[PDB]
């Protein structure tokens, strides 16, 4: 009923535009759905070298890849073989705003990902456009249903030069392709995302995420 393997390939193409700058990015990677770990090699095919911080894009490059325990419904693994899509708002504290789409589908041992990323109102002297971002801090997503739709909220923070932080609020909606796929209870998903290596101008990046679901206190 699932057909999600313990090892899967990941195939991804992103087209997008931030502060007027258009780009295209390709990803080929591998992951381990049931351990909640994945890794990806990203390559810019148009719009390079990007005039903005690469970190803003990186959560755009699948909650399938998260370790769900048994007492929590796993909507993402239950949305296959047919797949699902998500939509995200990234509200930055200094007025920068991004919206994002991923349409996720499966052929054999490979997830396919049609991704769209649009950003604006980023200040010219901000960390994004000055490229002063170091990494996303690990996070904790909250998952809840709001009018028959699974929703994730995250207080994200980008570490900057000098250990300052640049805030971002995520809200993501998640939508199974198949009707009447069972919504889960209110729960959490810890994340940690990480650029493992990158070339100088970020035309080549190697990314890794690790995520695990939990009920919160007292259970976790
Ligand atoms: O857990 S992360 O730092 O690889
Ligand atoms: O479950 S709480 O009340 O400790």
Which of 113, 120, 89, 119 is closest to 14 using CA atoms?
A: 113
Instruction: Name the experiment that determined this structure.
Output: X-ray
Does 14 sit behind a cis peptide bond, omega within 30 degrees of 0 on the bond before it?
no
Select from 66, 137, 159, 208 the residue to mutate for testing ligand 1; criterion: most ligand atoms less than 8 Å from CB: 208
Q: Whose CA is nearest to atom 2 of ligand 1?
A: 192
Resolution in A: 2.2
Asked if residue 218 has a cis previous peptide bond (ω within 30° of 0), the answer is yes
Q: Considering the domain 1-220 in this protein, what is its CATH number?
A: 2.40.155.10
Q: How far is the CA of 149 from the centre of ligand 1 (A)?
A: 30
Q: Whose CA is nearest to atom 1 of ligand 1?
A: 192
Q: Which residues contact 212 (CB under 8 A, 6 or more apart)?
A: 36, 66, 67, 189, 190
Residue located via tokens 């997008």: 16
Give 123-126's long-range contacts (Cβ < 8 A, gap of 24+): 123/94, 123/95, 123/96, 126/94, 126/96
Is 133 strand, coil or helix? strand
Tokens of 157: 């923070």
Decide: 192 in ligand 1 pocket, CB within 6 A.
yes
User: Regarding beta strands 21-32 and 8-18, do their DSSP bridges make them parallel or antiparallel, or are they unpaired?
Assistant: antiparallel
d(CA 88, CA 24): 19
Which pair of structure tokens corresponds to residue 2?
A: 């699932």
Q: Are 72 and 216 in contact (CB under 8 A)?
A: no
Distances from the Cα of 206 to the Cα of 66, 71, 118, 124, angstroms: 19, 33, 22, 27
The full set of domain ranges for the chain reads 1-220
Q: Is the CB of 103 under 6 A from ligand 1?
A: no
- Please give the distance, rounded to the nearest whole angstrom, from the Cα atom of residue 214 to the centre of ligand 2: 15
Sorted by sequence, the CB contacts under 8 Å of residue 164 that are 6+ apart come out as: none
Please report the atom of ligand 1 found closest to the CA of residue 210.
Answer: 1
Cβ(210) to ligand 1 under 6 A? yes
> Measuring CA to CA, which residue among 93, 88, 68, 86 is closest to residue 78?
68
Name 147's Cβ contacts closer than 8 Å, sequence gap at least 6: none
DSSP symbol at 182: P
**What is the distance in A from the centroid of ligand 2 to the CA of 93?**
34
Contact assessment for residue 160 and residue 133, using Cβ atoms and an 8 Å cutoff = yes
């Amino acid at each position: 009923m699932s057909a999600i393997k313990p090892d899967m390939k990941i195939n991804l193409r992103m087209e997008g535009n931030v502060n007027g700058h258009h780009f295209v990015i390709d990803g080929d990677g591998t992951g381990k759905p049931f351990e909640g770990k994945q890794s990806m090699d990203l390559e810019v095919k148009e719009g390079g070298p990007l005039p903005f911080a690469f970190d803003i894009l990186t959560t755009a490059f699948n909650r399938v890849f998260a370790e769900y325990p048994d007492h929590i419904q796993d909507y993402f693994k239950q949305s296959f073989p047919k797949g699902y899509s998500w939509e995200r708002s990234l509200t930055f504290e200094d007025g920068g705003i991004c919206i994002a789409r991923n349409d996720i589908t499966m052929e054999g041992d490979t997830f396919y990902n049609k991704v769209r990323f649009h950003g604006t109102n980023f200040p010219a002297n901000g960390p994004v456009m000055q490229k002063k971002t170091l990494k996303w801090e690990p996070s904790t997503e909250k998952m809840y249903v709001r009018d028959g739709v699974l929703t994730g909220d995250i207080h994200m923070a980008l570490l900057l030069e000098g250990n300052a932080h640049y805030r971002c609020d995520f809200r993501t909606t998640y939508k199974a392709k198949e009707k009447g796929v069972k919504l889960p209870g209110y729960h959490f998903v810890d994340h940690c995302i990480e650029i493992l290596s990158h070339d100088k101008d970020y035309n080549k990046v190697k990314l890794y995420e690790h995520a695990v679901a939990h009920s919160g206190l007292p259970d976790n």
